[PDB]
């Protein structure tokens, strides 16, 4: 198995650490789902007059 040549492990670990904990997460953090527009046509409490 080449998976066990434990002199090439750092060069496989560290760029994964980057691309999984930094770059992909930044790529997500720029993906935002705005809440749907809820145009409530009913927002009117002014009052009656003093009478």
């Amino acid at each position: 198995m080449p998976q066990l040549n434990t002199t090439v492990w750092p060069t496989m670990i560290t760029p994964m650490l980057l691309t999984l904990f930094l770059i992909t997460q930044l790529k997500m953090l720029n993906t935002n789902y705005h809440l749907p527009p809820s145009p409530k046509p009913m927002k009117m409490k002014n009052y009656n007059k003093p009478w």
Partner: protein, 53 residues
């Protein structure tokens, strides 16, 4: 009809003289002014209401 009928001495004339010489007490308002002033004050209040609105 009341002089040629009554047999009393001038009672028609003095009774109806008291009538034609009677002041009946004219009632007085004493109430329109207060409600007029109330109306003016309310006009003020709702004038400013409509200004705000």
């Amino acid at each position: 009809y009341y002089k040629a009928n009554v047999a009393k001495a001038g009672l028609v004339d003095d009774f109806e003289k008291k009538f034609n010489a009677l002041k009946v007490p004219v009632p007085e308002d004493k109430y329109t002014a207060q409600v007029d002033a109330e109306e003016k004050e309310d006009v003020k209040s709702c004038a400013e209401w409509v200004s705000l609105s």
